[PDB]
Amino acid sequence: QQEEVRKRCESAEPRHGELWCAVSKDIANWQKKIGDILRLVAGRIKNTF
Secondary structure, X not given: OHHHHHHHHHOOOOOHHHHXXXXXXXXXXXXXXXXXXOOOOOOOOOXXX
């Protein structure tokens, strides 16, 4: 079932990216390096402590 895990990693949910920010809150943070990993480098950094 690792194909399902890969599909979830690729697109978990439309709002999972926001949950990704929560994931950034969950582990590490949504910093410039984390923001540069995604398409936008300031969408979650403003909401990340």
